[PDB]
Amino acid sequence: KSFQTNVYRMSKFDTYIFNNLYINDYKMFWIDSGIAKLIDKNCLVSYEINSSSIILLKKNSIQRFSLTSLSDENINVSVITISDSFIRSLKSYILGDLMIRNLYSENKDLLLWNCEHNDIAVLSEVVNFREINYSDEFLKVFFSGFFSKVEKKYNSIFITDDLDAMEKISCLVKSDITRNWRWADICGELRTNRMILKKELESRGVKFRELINSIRISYSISLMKTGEFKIKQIAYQSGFASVSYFSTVFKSTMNVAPSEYLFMLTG
Ligand SMILES: CCCCCC/C=C\CCCCCCCC(=O)O
Ligand SMILES: [Cl-]
Ligand SMILES: [Cl-]
Ligand SMILES: [Cl-]
């Protein structure tokens, strides 16, 4: 209920490429073996990562990056998606750090942490096997402390404040994903003018249509993760005008066809 997990198979020397990928919830991912090369197109940095490198992706960010396998065997990429309800339960564990965190910047959307033995073991277990599950207290302490040391390393906010304008925009769109959203609706619903709100899109490198489409793709991904497989139904449930429009945007965003992503999940 707190963590949704996926393990993707990555073939030798394959490359996954994401363009305008909207991060609907906080995510963490890492490879289980070998080496990979992560290229972050938004900041123009590359990382060689190994099985202890954790990549954290901030909620409401718009990602542009590739991941290239450098191993001659299959690599498994584990992905934890953290529920909003679990994040909210961390509020008391970092509130005391308000003075500390108000000094941090808010720009970085993709963060790396090189793990010690104990930390990668816990994260693997979340994705896996224990007869007695970690307690709620253990998990809240582990993840608040983990995010805290990542934030300190970068002097940067990872867990964004509840009042952020991008969260207001995204939450509104996600409340009625098929609505024929236009900028005026956002300004009207948030009672905030365009001069203020537009920086949320500008700083993320998207125009309005690209933003709405990106949120709709991540909705379709969520539907597929629940076991929906009827491509036409998925396209319409997610607010696309047609299957062809859905497929075109999905291909641009994920660099694979919807049918191929379904196979990565269920095949
Ligand atoms: C077409 C690629 C399929 C997904 C492979 C994911 C591998 C590395 C990136 C992990 C973070 C982005 C995951 C997006 C899909 C998801 O939400 O599970
Ligand atoms: Cl629309
Ligand atoms: Cl009003
Ligand atoms: Cl715009």
Residue numbers in the entry: 5 to 132, 134 to 272
The authors write:
ToxT is an AraC-family transcriptional activator of Vibrio cholerae virulence-gene expression, with a C-terminal DNA-binding domain and an N-terminal domain involved in dimerization and effector binding. ToxT directly activates the expression of the genes encoding the toxin-coregulated pilus (TCP), which is essential for colonization of the human intestine, and the cholera toxin (CT), the cause of the diarrheal disease that is characteristic of cholera. In V. cholerae, ToxT-dependent gene activation is inhibited by both bile and individual unsaturated fatty acids found in bile. Although oleic acid is likely to be the physiological effector of ToxT given its high concentration in bile, both PAM and oleic acid have been shown to reduce the expression of tcp and ctx in vivo and to reduce DNA binding by ToxT in vitro.
However, the structure determined by Lowden et al. contains a disordered region between residues Asp101 and Glu110 within the N-terminal domain. Interestingly, Asp101–Glu110 could be modeled in this structure, which included helix α1 and a loop region that connects this helix to the β9 sheet. In this region, helix α1 spans Ser87–Ile98 and contains a kink at Leu94. This is followed by a 310-helix spanning Leu99–Asp101 that continues into a shorter helix from Leu102 to Leu107 (α1′). Tyr108–Asp113 form a connecting loop between α1′ and β9. This region appears to be stabilized by residue Glu156, in helix α3, through a salt bridge with residue Arg105. Interestingly, the ToxT region between α1 and β9 (residues Asp101–Glu110) is folded over a loop that is located sequentially after it: the loop that connects helices α3 and α4, spanning residues Lys158–Ala170. Our structure suggests the possibility that Arg105 holds Glu156 in a position that somewhat attenuates ToxT activity. In addition, three chloride ions were modeled in the C-terminal region of ToxT, which were assigned based on the coordination distances (∼3.1–3.3 Å) to neighboring residues and water molecules. Overall, the new structure provides more complete, detailed and higher quality structural information for ToxT than the previously determined ToxT structure.
